[PDB]
Nucleic acid binder design. Structure first.
Length: 70
DNA sequence: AAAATTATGAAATTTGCATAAATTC
DNA sequence: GAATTTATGCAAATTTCATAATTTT
């Protein structure tokens, strides 16, 4: 049931942290447009669902992601 | 109304289906 | 050589760039 709702959850987190789509989605290497289409109910591919899941529950940290970008 | 943010059409890239090739047993 | 595993051409679905529309300040 959850994969269809996860993007909306993701949006609520981001909103609550007062982050742009660019800021939030790019930690995962996901573009702003793509973030926009997910937040409005485009099919969330399973790997992105997994990442959002682990992120939202606090198991993957912003710092871990920032380390991996660089 | 300018700046910043989000949404969208369409080109290009990526994925997964069919199945061909290869490998294992 | 059959079963199983892996690779590959290509259709289709997905991503992103370019930018339009919207929202914020």
């Amino acid at each position: 049931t959850q994969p269809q709702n996860m993007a909306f959850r993701a949006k609520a987190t981001r909103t609550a942290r007062r982050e742009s789509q660019e800021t939030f989605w790019s930690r995962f290497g996901i573009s702003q447009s793509c973030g926009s289409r997910f937040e409005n109910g485009e099919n969330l591919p399973f790997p992105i669902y997994l990442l959002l899941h682990f992120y939202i529950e606090g198991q993957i940290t912003d710092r871990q992601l920032a380390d991996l970008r660089g």
